[PDB]
Every structure is written in structure tokens, then in C-alpha cells.
Amino acid sequence: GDVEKGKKIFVQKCAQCHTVEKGGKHKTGPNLHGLFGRKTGQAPGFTYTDANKNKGITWKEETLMEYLENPKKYIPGTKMIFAGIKKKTEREDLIAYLKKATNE
Ligand code: HEC
């Protein structure tokens, strides 16, 4: 995916509720540093719904592709109130940005 395009999506659509840097603040949603390769619901210091705590999957390209298409369908009960991203390419780009920015 295209990291530049993903950055723009993140800033426009996600930053309202999320940070990505190491040690960054929780907002409505959790800080996302360290996301890849970790189970759902594991950002230190954030109180998740039971649903996000218990989904029991590992975040990686394939699972983020599905989640970001329709968050509520993937994690019923989630408190992330955000419209799914329909376009596959946009999800790919966003995920490439996340994979970089959440792993500095
Ligand atoms: C506020 C209105 C949000 C917007 C906009 C986005 N997200 Fe979000 N996210 C939000 C909350 C409140 C939560 C926790 C939900 C819960 O039920 O406890 C989340 C969670 C995520 C996760 C899961 C994190 C985990 O550690 O399992 C991811 C991967 C995530 N959010 C990503 C994300 C992206 C990339 C967004 C823009 C497309 C985005 N979120 C928007 C709140 C909000």
C-alpha cells in the first residue's frame, strides 16, 4: 500500500480519536503504537469494551483489512463509532501507513 495516501486517510479520518507514536496519549480511542502482531485490546492503560478485549485475534494486514471495512460487524459491541471504509485500496494504503507509523 501507499504510505502517503494512508497518512492522509489517518489524519483526516482517525486522528480525531487516535495517536500512533510511542507513549502517545489515549483519546476517545487507544494509542495504536505496537498494534501489529498483538492481540486485540492490548494498548497499555486503555479501558476497552469486553468485545474489543475478547475478540481474540491478532492485528495484521488481513484482520485490519476486514475490521476497517466495517468495525461494528467485526467487533459487535465496540465503542469505536466509525463508518467502514468501502474501498479496498484505501484500506490497503491506510494499513501500510499504520504498519510504519505504529512501529517507529
Ligand atoms: C472515535 C470517534 C474513533 C474514530 C474516528 C476511530 N476510532 Fe478506532 N477506536 C475507537 C475506540 C473508542 C476504540 C476502542 C473500542 C472498544 O470497543 O473498546 C477504537 C479501537 C480501534 C482499534 C482496535 C485497537 C486494539 O487495541 O484492539 C483499531 C485498530 C482502531 N480503532 C483503528 C482506527 C482507525 C485506523 C481509524 C480510522 C480509519 C479509527 N480507528 C477511527 C474510536 C475511534
UniProtKB/Swiss-Prot annotation:
<comment type="similarity">
    <text>Belongs to the cytochrome c family.</text>
</comment>
<feature type="modified residue" description="N-acetylglycine">
    <location>
        <position position="1"/>
    </location>
</feature>
<keyword id="KW-0679">Respiratory chain</keyword>
<dbReference type="Pfam" id="PF00034">
    <property type="entry name" value="Cytochrom_C"/>
</dbReference>
<feature type="binding site" description="axial binding residue">
    <location>
        <position position="80"/>
    </location>
    <ligand>
        <name>heme c</name>
    </ligand>
</feature>
<feature type="binding site" description="covalent">
    <location>
        <position position="17"/>
    </location>
    <ligand>
        <name>heme c</name>
    </ligand>
</feature>
<keyword id="KW-0007">Acetylation</keyword>
<comment type="function">
    <text>Plays a role in apoptosis. Suppression of the anti-apoptotic members or activation of the pro-apoptotic members of the Bcl-2 family leads to altered mitochondrial membrane permeability resulting in release of cytochrome c into the cytosol. Binding of cytochrome c to Apaf-1 triggers the activation of caspase-9, which then accelerates apoptosis by activating other caspases.</text>
</comment>
<dbReference type="GO" id="GO:0006123">
    <property type="term" value="P:mitochondrial electron transport, cytochrome c to oxygen"/>
</dbReference>
<keyword id="KW-0349">Heme</keyword>
<dbReference type="GO" id="GO:0046872">
    <property type="term" value="F:metal ion binding"/>
</dbReference>
<dbReference type="GO" id="GO:0008289">
    <property type="term" value="F:lipid binding"/>
</dbReference>
<dbReference type="GO" id="GO:0097190">
    <property type="term" value="P:apoptotic signaling pathway"/>
</dbReference>
<dbReference type="GO" id="GO:0006122">
    <property type="term" value="P:mitochondrial electron transport, ubiquinol to cytochrome c"/>
</dbReference>
<dbReference type="GO" id="GO:0020037">
    <property type="term" value="F:heme binding"/>
</dbReference>
<keyword id="KW-0479">Metal-binding</keyword>
<feature type="modified residue" description="Phosphotyrosine">
    <location>
        <position position="48"/>
    </location>
</feature>
<keyword id="KW-0496">Mitochondrion</keyword>
<keyword id="KW-0249">Electron transport</keyword>
<dbReference type="InterPro" id="IPR002327">
    <property type="entry name" value="Cyt_c_1A/1B"/>
</dbReference>
<dbReference type="GO" id="GO:0018063">
    <property type="term" value="P:cytochrome c-heme linkage"/>
</dbReference>
<dbReference type="InterPro" id="IPR009056">
    <property type="entry name" value="Cyt_c-like_dom"/>
</dbReference>
<keyword id="KW-0597">Phosphoprotein</keyword>
<keyword id="KW-0408">Iron</keyword>
<dbReference type="GO" id="GO:0009055">
    <property type="term" value="F:electron transfer activity"/>
</dbReference>
<dbReference type="GO" id="GO:0070069">
    <property type="term" value="C:cytochrome complex"/>
</dbReference>
<feature type="binding site" description="axial binding residue">
    <location>
        <position position="18"/>
    </location>
    <ligand>
        <name>heme c</name>
    </ligand>
</feature>
<protein>
    <recommendedName>
        <fullName>Cytochrome c</fullName>
    </recommendedName>
</protein>
<dbReference type="GO" id="GO:0005758">
    <property type="term" value="C:mitochondrial intermembrane space"/>
</dbReference>
<feature type="modified residue" description="Phosphotyrosine">
    <location>
        <position position="97"/>
    </location>
</feature>
<dbReference type="GO" id="GO:0042802">
    <property type="term" value="F:identical protein binding"/>
</dbReference>
<keyword id="KW-0813">Transport</keyword>
<dbReference type="InterPro" id="IPR036909">
    <property type="entry name" value="Cyt_c-like_dom_sf"/>
</dbReference>
<feature type="modified residue" description="N6-acetyllysine; alternate">
    <location>
        <position position="72"/>
    </location>
</feature>
<feature type="modified residue" description="N6-succinyllysine; alternate">
    <location>
        <position position="72"/>
    </location>
</feature>
<feature type="modified residue" description="N6-acetyllysine">
    <location>
        <position position="99"/>
    </location>
</feature>
<feature type="modified residue" description="N6-succinyllysine">
    <location>
        <position position="55"/>
    </location>
</feature>
<feature type="binding site" description="covalent">
    <location>
        <position position="14"/>
    </location>
    <ligand>
        <name>heme c</name>
    </ligand>
</feature>
<keyword id="KW-0053">Apoptosis</keyword>
<comment type="function">
    <text>Electron carrier protein. The oxidized form of the cytochrome c heme group can accept an electron from the heme group of the cytochrome c1 subunit of cytochrome reductase. Cytochrome c then transfers this electron to the cytochrome oxidase complex, the final protein carrier in the mitochondrial electron-transport chain.</text>
</comment>
<dbReference type="GO" id="GO:0005829">
    <property type="term" value="C:cytosol"/>
</dbReference>
